[PDB]
Amino acid sequence: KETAAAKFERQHMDSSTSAASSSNYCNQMMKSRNLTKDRCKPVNTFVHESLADVQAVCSQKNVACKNGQTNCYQSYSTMSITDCRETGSSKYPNCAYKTTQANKHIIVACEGNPYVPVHFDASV
Numbered sequence: 186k187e188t189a190a191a192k193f194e195r196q197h198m199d200s201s202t203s204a205a206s207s208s209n210y211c212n213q214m215m216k217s218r219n220l221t222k223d224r225c226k227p228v229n230t231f232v233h234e235s236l237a238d239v240q241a242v243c244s245q246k247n248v249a250c251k252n253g254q255t256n257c258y259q260s261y262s263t264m265s266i267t268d269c270r271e272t273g274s275s276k277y278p279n280c281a282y283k284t285t286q287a288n289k290h291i292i293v294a295c296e297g298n299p300y301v302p303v304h305f306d307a308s309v
């Protein structure tokens with residue numbers, strides 16, 4: 186059964202420098218990562234850094250999470266990311282996305298032993 190850490194990897198990790206894809210990065214990735222299965226996940230961030238650099242964020246800048254938890258962490262360096270956000274005409278199961286590429290500081294929530302990212306909180 187998928188661990189919280191595994192799920193963050195499937196949902197958010199795409200280690201590859203930058204978005205690369207055949208047609209439309211978000212439409213393809215949101216499908217392939219199973220984020221269109223039971224509905225159109227409305228917004229999803231992919232991170233294009235190594236797993237090691239992302240995991241490292243759990244010991245970087247401690248910040249409050251959007252939901253009021255205190256177990257979130259902001260990266261010290263900007264990171265390559267892509268934002269996927271569902272278009273207005275998107276309707277499950279015909280999920281369609283707008284692709285926005287960015288280099289920003291990521292904020293992840295981290296949990297467990299070992300203490301690793303389980304949730305993608307914000308980009309700053």
Ligand SMILES: N=C(N)NCCC[C@H](NP(=O)(O)OC[C@H]1O[C@@H](n2cnc3c(N)ncnc32)[C@H](O)[C@@H]1O)C(=O)O
Pocket residue numbers: 196197228229230231250251252254294303304305306307
């Ligand atoms: N709710 C926040 N802060 N973010 C949700 C949208 C951002 C989206 N992050 P995500 O898919 O990794 O996580 C969203 C889910 O995470 C739950 N969630 C919100 N705060 C959380 C937290 N502090 N820790 C674990 N899960 C949290 C939300 O209810 C959503 O179900 C992204 O990819 O950009």
